Design a protein around this ligand. Structure first.
Ligand SMILES: Nc1nc2c(ncn2[C@@H]2O[C@H](COP(=O)(O)OP(=O)(O)O)[C@@H](O)[C@H]2O)c(=O)[nH]1
Ligand SMILES: Nc1nc2c(ncn2[C@@H]2O[C@H](COP(=O)(O)OP(=O)(O)O)[C@@H](O)[C@H]2O)c(=O)[nH]1
Ligand SMILES: O=P(O)(O)OC[C@H]1O[C@@H](n2cnc3c(OP(=O)(O)O)ncnc32)[C@H](O)[C@@H]1O
Ligand SMILES: O=P(O)(O)OC[C@H]1O[C@@H](n2cnc3c(OP(=O)(O)O)ncnc32)[C@H](O)[C@@H]1O
Ligand SMILES: O=CN(O)CC(=O)O
Ligand SMILES: O=CN(O)CC(=O)O
Ligand SMILES: [Mg+2]
Ligand SMILES: [Mg+2]
Lengths: 431, 431
């Protein structure tokens, strides 16, 4: 107890959009603190409660919980205009006094308008050069994380300190990018002015996140929830590089993005969609570009919560999941969108990859090798029944139960939740 | 046990060069695997054994241990020429068959010659512009971590796959930098050719680090040691930004740099020098630019193991140490270079900072605020006796013991080791 309490973590086990927003929302009901540790607003997390639906991006999904404090960690890159723009969209949905329960770490880096603009330019440039780009959300996430590493980026604490100093580096940073993209137009005083405004708006919410989390973990017992963004296979280190996002979406990102030791990390839940989706460029072994893909894409309403882009769809892929578990060490899983499969007579599930007629011993570090593998499946029998109404383990029909077990067994991790709808109550807790 | 074994970690608690090489060497004697998780060869870790001295940079310090396997994780950025150049320097010291016990993660990013060249240029540019630069080791660490985030950098697996594809992106990446520094000269085919050579040299050592560490942690019990590089206050997120290195030197870096969950991290030792040193630009509250600084710098032989640069010296600083503990959650400490203090009649120790005559509640996120604080000290009585010979807790004289306790008490972390020399046997294990 001297060490402190342990946070609960919700992580994406695939290529994002697995249902982290829904899982976090569920768990956030009785949490004292809900936080984001990495990424920016490239994330799109959907929460449904009482017929009311919200789409969060920078705001932690537990922001709707009026008793809880939503915290944005130092690992997150913030675009201030987008933040308020987002918060103000949810005001119109009933989000009241959110600015009263939102803490922002003063070490978080800032996404500047030219970062997003550079994001665009770099994509058009890679496309109109090598034929294809990464397919980023063009939210300037990659550019801003690149300025962070370079140590040229600015942080919250910078914006709130002397503004004349800030403006000095801001002008200099901008110029640096214009050197990358001469055709890049930046309204220095224009943007810089708005920034000056934002400073006073955010100021009251800002704090030292390190002391904040530390004090929280060692003071009277509290329940802290960490909302992962993106997912394992999108991890800058472990994902399908270079077709990944620019932050560590894996468990280690919790430590680096909030400044807490591995001794303060409790349960780490892996959010697993019953089938796989990917939005953007890059290998997708079980991708189904056919009638099956369309049923999944359509029945699942698979379109970017952030870009409106239609997501690619495929069968469940155990190779990526097992790989994800090796890096995150999930304590239990949340198997989502099981109901999407209610209508299939049979459901194929990828179990291994084969390159030269030979099976691969492990998930390829080289993404191109992945674009050449021939996955071998395990056809399972559908249940052809509506499960959207199930609320208990028994409500599920026989073949639905077998599907959950198939997942538990081939991964070696227990399924603690089963999603059968997008609304908070459309959940089944198995233990 | 189902989860697996837990690794032991050695981290720097200050601004580097605290003695991690000496601590790792000590602990590596009976380790099965010793690894690096972040940084590159900007690191300089000194090991002394049997009168024989080694200076490691990319090679894990446990490389001298012939029974153990030295592993370079995916969080590390490698400059191949420097790696062999380093390994070949230690051959001339008796390092035999090292290439037989060195594993290299195939996801590690590559530092290219132009990265180091860009490092130089950027420094000269910041200096000859705003008056001062960061004071990097000019090993191209910042530039290569910036290419990683941008997803433009290349990795081991890339170098070893099709070389024609590699060369394609290599040429493109180079051009990108020349756009940053037009005066930057790159011998594409020249460098690219050498790279082609290195590929075959490193190839046999490369492996999938994720599967490697995973298998190691779950197979028959083994002892894995993780050698941190740089230190807490140099952390890209938590250090004295922008006067920091470009990787997470804190505990979370172990998870992201090796792909292991917080559940596989055991003891995390903080290496603490009895006084503080910093090499490069940036705030240094207890810095002693005087006769005291010279005695410390001189008696301690404080000059860069990597750049030959004379390190800045100051009294011990508890503010940074306590802050370091908040982020790393040290389980025990290694108080090094206690013997350097053998001659002082009294020893001042910084306990808090004061900005406006008022004490600060916590370590400033803004580094400039740090350049304005007035530290308040706690003068302790020296022992004025030679401790270089002590090997037990009792050998130490009264005032030496009080110094160790002062540290244990003001940090809330136990000192498990006390350094009284640079040789492996010049250690005292308190428990
Ligand atoms: N039918 C159904 N929809 C679900 C379920 N869980 C989540 N969803 C929806 O699936 C979508 C997942 O996209 P997204 O919100 O981006 O996931 P996130 O980015 O991981 O938070 C959302 O529109 C959710 O409402 C489930 O169990 N069943
Ligand atoms: N006298 C003395 N020297 C020590 C002790 N521990 C380490 N050193 C020396 O202090 C220096 C620390 O620099 P460095 O090797 O860069 O530390 P690292 O980068 O943290 O591994 C080395 O030259 C060590 O040999 C100690 O207890 N006493
Ligand atoms: O540089 P970026 O803008 O991050 O784009 C890099 C790649 O990563 C993808 N991507 C980024 N965030 C994603 C997300 O987040 P959530 O699960 O939190 O809703 N869900 C799905 N895909 C996501 C993009 O489509 C792109 O291929
Ligand atoms: O971009 P970089 O080349 O990393 O420089 C950024 C800043 O970080 C410092 N620095 C980097 N590695 C260091 C080291 O490592 P070890 O403790 O492992 O031996 N020990 C001390 N100082 C170190 C540099 O002096 C500089 O101010
Ligand atoms: O929910 C977020 N994503 O799916 C990203 C996007 O819309 O591209
Ligand atoms: O041991 C490494 N450092 O001290 C870095 C340097 O020499 O600058
Ligand atoms: Mg989403
Ligand atoms: Mg060193």
């Amino acid at each position: 107890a001297a060490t402190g309490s342990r946070v609960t973590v919700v992580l994406g086990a695939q290529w994002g959009d697995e249902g982290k927003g829904k899982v976090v929302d569920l768990l956030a009901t009785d949490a004292d603190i809900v936080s984001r540790c990495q990424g920016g607003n490239n994330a799109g997390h959907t929460v449904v409660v009482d017929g009311k639906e919200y789409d969060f991006h920078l705001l932690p999904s537990g922001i709707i919980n009026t008793k809880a404090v939503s915290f944005i960690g130092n690992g997150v890159v913030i675009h201030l205009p987008g933040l308020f723009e987002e918060a103000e969209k949810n005001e119109k949905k009933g989000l009241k006094d959110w600015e009263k329960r939102l803490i922002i770490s003063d070490r978080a880096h800032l996404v500047f308008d030219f970062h997003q603009a550079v994001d665009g330019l770099q994509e058009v440039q890679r496309q109109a050069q090598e034929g294809k780009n990464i397919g980023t959300t063009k939210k300037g996430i990659g550019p801003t994380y690149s300025s962070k590493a370079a140590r040229t980026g600015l942080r919250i604490c910078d914006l709130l300190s002397d503004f004349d100093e800030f403006s000095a580096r801001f002008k200099n940073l901008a110029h640096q990018h214009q050197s990358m993209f001469p055709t890049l137009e930046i309204d220095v005083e224009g943007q810089l002015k708005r920034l000056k405004g934002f400073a006073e708006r955010i100021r009251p919410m800002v704090r030292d996140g390190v002391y904040f989390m530390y004090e929280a973990l060692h003071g009277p017992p509290k329940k802290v929830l960490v909302e992962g963004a993106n997912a394992a296979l999108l991890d800058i280190d472990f994902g399908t590089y270079p077709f990944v996002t620019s932050s560590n979406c894996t468990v280690g990102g919790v430590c680096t993005g909030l400044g807490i030791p591995p001794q303060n990390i409790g349960d780490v839940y892996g959010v697993v969609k019953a089938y796989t989706t990917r939005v953007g460029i890059g290998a997708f072994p079980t991708e189904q570009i056919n009638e099956i893909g369309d049923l999944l894409q359509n029945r699942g309403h698979e379109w970017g919560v952030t870009t409106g882009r239609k997501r690619r769809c495929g069968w469940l892929d155990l190779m990526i999941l097992r790989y994800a578990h090796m890096v995150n060490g999930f304590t239990a899983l949340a198997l989502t969108k099981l109901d999407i499969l209610d209508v299939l007579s049979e459901i194929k599930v990828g179990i291994s990859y084969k390159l030269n007629g030979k099976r691969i011993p492990y998930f390829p570090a080289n993404q191109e090798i992945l674009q050449k593998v021939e996955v071998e499946y395990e056809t399972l029998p559908g249940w052809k029944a509506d499960t959207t109404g199930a609320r208990k383990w028994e409500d599920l029909p026989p073949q639905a139960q077998s599907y959950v077990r198939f997942v538990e067994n081939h991964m070696g991790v227990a399924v603690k939740w089963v999603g059968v709808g997008k609304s908070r109550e459309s959940m089944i807790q198995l233990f």
